[PDB]
Amino acid sequence: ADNLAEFHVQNQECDSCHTPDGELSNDSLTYENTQCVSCHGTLAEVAETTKHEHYNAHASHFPGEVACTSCHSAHEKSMVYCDSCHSFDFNMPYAKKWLRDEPTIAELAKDKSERQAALASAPHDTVDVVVVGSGGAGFSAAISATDSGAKVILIEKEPVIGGNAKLAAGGMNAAWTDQQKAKKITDSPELMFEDTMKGGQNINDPALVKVLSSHSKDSVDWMTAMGADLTDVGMMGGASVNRAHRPTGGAGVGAHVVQVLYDNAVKRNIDLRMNTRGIEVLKDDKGTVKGILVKGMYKGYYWVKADAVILATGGFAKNNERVAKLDPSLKGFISTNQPGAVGDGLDVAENAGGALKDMQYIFAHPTLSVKGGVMVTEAVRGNGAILVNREGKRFVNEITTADKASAAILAQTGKSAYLIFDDSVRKSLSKIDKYIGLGVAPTADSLVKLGKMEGIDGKALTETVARYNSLVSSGKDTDFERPNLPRALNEGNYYAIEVTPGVHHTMGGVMIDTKAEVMNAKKQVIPGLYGAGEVTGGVHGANRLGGNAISDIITFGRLAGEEAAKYS
């Protein structure tokens, strides 16, 4: 057979997969995926038949219910979504090599044609609020508007939910929580605000940073009431005390928080549409929002009539061409992001009149795995790991800010460095087990052996760990001044992870005020239009602290949903 449908119709009728009239149920292909499942079983049952020791196409870290048509199309060859970040040995029937080629909003002008007919038609749906983007900000705003009494439609352009938010690892910053008090940490919204401003070189908008610090406990309480586990609190770069919250044991905050938000939307019967791209915000004759034109992958163009539109589309760190125009030093670097994080949401916001700010400030995360090409969390250093160069020595304060960490690594021989830690660090953070499963953390029972394995001077590395453990012991790093020294590297085996910098987060974006209303260049509100999460600029200034973006999307998403519901 040349394709999956052809294969099955050798022994089955068209209605084994299609509805009685044959039309596709919707852009999420709900009815059609139910038919795949009635014969093959759920995703978990199929995964029983495709096990591999350390990976499995049908059982991954992605949260929610991943549709089969995400990777298996019927009438044409299709791509394995996992190939956008990894290179596992896979053999999916009727596959083709991963290639992302999505037209820009500008290029979709070509469809003037079909777009005009859609806009001349009656709205396909009439609701109060439309949220664009199924990341942490978009789910938060959809739930909060629904709880406030508004009828919502939430759209996602990708086949799977969660965007970059489902990948988060190290934590969600918040201050003065019940969770901190239980671990005996002392902190305050005032200290979180100060760390944040100084971390961002005082470019941040102070009014947005106050919303960030003052609503932070409330956002952790809201998530926990909905079923989240945020009881583990860790340290991240540039913070005065531990304040990065995550599940018990040090698991990834990201996949868990998005699973909780998805379960909660499903319980409220929230109309969630996949493979549906927001294209153009529509305004009436007095310039207030009247709806949004969308492009359904399977259904075509249509518009939804509504009082308010909330843009929660995330950043553009996967778009290296746009990144390089703003920061020529990052051209050619690998990204940590999902394949659709390209900035099309920003183009939608600007075409609607929104102005942008702080676009030149791009976060380069210092520690991508050279071997695996994926982010390695900053919590590995927060929980006690060190960095060494090819000469076997320390060269930087490992919990300094992302900008300084990346420069110091690129100044080392070969332009990369190695995280070094032991089994005490490994056991304090369950996420480290995931790196070991991926095959990017070689280990040995002595540093001489480890060094020999990875090309690091063995006797210098042994001396380096011995000296660092003495500094931990006495409580002061006189070589590089790391202010937090939580563990000696001396329990069980040793591990090494080769790391180098990659493109990760864009701190600029659409201008919003403290009620998350989008503004134009004269600082006027555009009525009915909201922005929440990494699509916005002004919260993080010149350098974002680790843990502050998950805090941002929950706070600003929830706020935007409440404000849109009230507005109408």
Least distance in Å: CB of 481 to ligand FUM? 21
Least distance in Å: CB of 53 to ligand HEM? 10
Cα-flanking dihedrals φ and ψ of residue 8, to 5°? -65, -35
Which of 24-32, 179-187, 508-516, 554-562 is the region at the interface with ligand HEM (rule: CB under 6 A)? 24-32
Closer to Na ion by Cβ: residue 509 or 546: 509
Q: Which helix (H) or strand (E) holds 501?
A: strand 494-506
Closer to ligand FUM by Cβ: residue 170 or 451: 170
Scan residues 379-418 and list those touching ligand FUM (CB under 6 A). 379
Asked if 347 and 358 count as a contact pair (C-beta separation under 8 A), the reply is no
Cα-flanking dihedrals φ and ψ of residue 441, to 5°? -125, 75
Cα–Cα distance between 408 and 404 in angstroms, integer?
Answer: 6
Closer to ligand FUM by Cβ: residue 416 or 520: 416
The secondary structure of residue 122, as a DSSP letter, is P
Cα–Cα distance between 179 and 163 in angstroms, integer?
Answer: 27
Kindly state whether residue 502 participates in binding ligand FUM, applying the rule CB under 6 A.
no
Cα–Cα distance between 341 and 534 in angstroms, integer?
Answer: 10
Q: Cα angle vertex 151, ends 516, 211, to 5°?
A: 20
Cα–Cα distance between 484 and 93 in angstroms, integer?
Answer: 51
Q: Which two tokens stand for residue 222?
A: 């809201």
Closer to ligand FAD by Cβ: residue 167 or 174: 167
Which of 38-46, 97-105, 181-189, 542-550 is the region at the interface with ligand FUM (rule: CB under 6 A)? 542-550
Kindly state whether residue 377 participates in binding ligand FUM, applying the rule CB under 6 A.
yes
Site size toward Na ion (CB under 5 A) is 3
Query: Which of 502, 547, 557, 561 contacts ligand FUM by CB under 6 A?
Result: 547
Note every long-range contact of 76-85, with CB atoms under 8 Å and residues 24 or more positions apart, other chains counting: 76/3, 77/3, 81/159, 81/160, 82/57, 84/338, 84/339, 85/373, 85/374
Q: β-strand 232-234 against 244-246: which pairing, if any?
A: antiparallel
Least distance in Å: CB of 376 to ligand FUM? 7
Name the residue with the smallest CB distance to ligand FAD.
135
Cα–Cα distance between 398 and 419 in angstroms, integer?
Answer: 9
Instruction: Look at the chain and count its residues.
Output: 568
Closer to ligand HEM by Cβ: residue 158 or 347: 158
The secondary structure of residue 185, as a DSSP letter, is -
Least distance in Å: CB of 235 to ligand FAD? 13
Least distance in Å: CB of 188 to ligand FAD? 19
Q: Which two tokens stand for residue 463?
A: 């001396």
455 binds, among ligand FUM, ligand FAD, ligand HEM, none (CB under 5 to 8 A by kind): none
Cα–Cα distance between 448 and 467 in angstroms, integer?
Answer: 15
Least distance in Å: CB of 3 to ligand FUM? 40
Q: Which two tokens stand for residue 515?
A: 């009620």
x/- map, 458-497, Na ion, by CB under 5 A: ----------------------------------------
Amino acid (1-letter code) at residue 349: A
Nearest to 232 by CA among 214, 253, 218, 211: 253
Query: Which of 133, 199, 372, 546 contacts ligand FUM by CB under 6 A?
Result: 546
Which of 291-299, 326-334, 545-553, 556-564 is the region at the interface with ligand FUM (rule: CB under 6 A)? 545-553
Scan residues 112-171 and list those touching ligand FUM (CB under 6 A). 169-170
Nearest to 209 by CA among 191, 224, 222: 191
What is the CB-side half-sphere exposure of residue 447 using CA atoms within 13 A? 22
Q: Cα angle vertex 506, ends 504, 507, to 5°?
A: 125
Rounded (10°) CA dihedral 61, 66, 72, 76: -120
Kindly state whether residue 415 participates in binding ligand HEM, applying the rule CB under 6 A.
no
Site size toward ligand FUM (CB under 6 A) is 9
Nearest to 398 by CA among 362, 366, 442: 366
x/- map, 219-258, ligand FUM, by CB under 6 A: ----------------------------------------
Kindly state whether residue 316 participates in binding ligand HEM, applying the rule CB under 6 A.
no
Closer to ligand HEM by Cβ: residue 133 or 200: 133
Strand partners, 132: 155, 311
Least distance in Å: CB of 343 to ligand FAD? 8
Least distance in Å: CB of 336 to ligand FAD? 4
Query: Which of 534, 552, 562, 563 contacts Na ion by CB under 5 A?
Result: 534
Cα-flanking dihedrals φ and ψ of residue 507, to 5°? -70, -20
Query: Which of 27, 28, 63, 80 contacts ligand HEM by CB under 6 A?
Result: 80
534 binds, among ligand FUM, ligand HEM, Na ion, none (CB under 5 to 8 A by kind): Na ion
Closer to ligand FUM by Cβ: residue 253 or 518: 253
Kindly state whether residue 533 participates in binding ligand FUM, applying the rule CB under 6 A.
no
DSSP H stretches of helix in 376-442: 379-382, 402-410, 423-428, 432-438
Least distance in Å: CB of 319 to ligand FUM? 18
Q: Using CB under 6 A as the criterion, which residues of the chain lie in contact with ligand HEM when the complex forms?
A: 4-5, 7-9, 12, 14, 16-18, 24, 29, 32, 35-37, 39-40, 42-43, 46, 49-50, 54-55, 57-58, 60-62, 66, 68-76, 80-82, 84-86, 90-93, 167, 169, 252, 298, 338, 374-375, 434, 437-438
Q: Using CB under 5 A as the criterion, which residues of the chain lie in contact with Na ion when the complex forms?
A: 506, 509, 534
